[PDB]
Subunit: 57 residues, 6 copies
């Protein structure tokens, strides 16, 4: 499984490290897939690049 997660910029390296591990374990557990087969890509969004309802967040 391959996961791409879009998140707002501003979290620490440590926090993103935690995100990758926790999500990867979640995918492995949910799907009964080998942990080693799970890849996660974190994509950061700048504040001026993410809109909800046509307006900036």
């Amino acid at each position: 499984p391959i996961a791409q997660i879009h998140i707002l910029e501003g979290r620490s390296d440590e926090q993103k490290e935690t995100l990758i591990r926790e999500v990867s374990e979640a995918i492995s557990r949910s799907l009964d897939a080998p942990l080693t087969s799970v890849r996660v890509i974190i994509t950061e969004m700048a504040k001026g690049h993410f809109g909800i309802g046509g307006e900036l967040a």
Copy 2:
């Protein structure tokens, strides 16, 4: 936050609902983001559409 997860075809409806819930909670805990703000997209891959090392998986 928005997660798009590519997975191989063959999973049950039950596994995919669990995947969405478990990845969403993992995201929520890891980033201290409200659960209600987490969105997850499941994308299924057919066996002839996923390659590893230039060969079909």
Copy 3:
């Protein structure tokens, strides 16, 4: 410019054709880019494949 739009299943062909035209024109005018350079990809999501707050939408 390349736009990928994830939408829920259930929309008509005209609605999607209109979606493609209006989004392409909106991109073209906002960015002063030639309409002919604008590409739009519609990706339909099955009901069990889209999550909000850890639950199906």
Copy 4:
């Protein structure tokens, strides 16, 4: 509805703001979807990262 738009780098903040607003109404109107449910992600591409016909 969620739109991810890949655009070339170099545009200013006001133009990207306009892009977000204009695309969001277009999606909303076309699909008879609530404006507030429409999400737009702008992804900027550096000039050395986007190829057409094998060349930048």
Copy 5:
């Protein structure tokens, strides 16, 4: 490396296998990356779902 390729539906299975092998090798040679680390995802587009210049493909 992870490659996602959007193409219009209508190609043969053989044709998509060739695409996956050829793209994987091109990535491998260009990056001096082991072929085995290269993953390719093919995403097919339905005829009514791809727009160029505001018009259907």
Copy 6:
């Protein structure tokens, strides 16, 4: 055809230009599509943003 390739950060501009060219030709050759129709997007991943098996790669 549109290919998005996620690669780890750190390559020079000329190597990525080579990657774009070689992948584009492979796609053109495999699908018998006019090269002018092939679009390729390079997306660099920071080291702290790419996980394999829940750990940074």
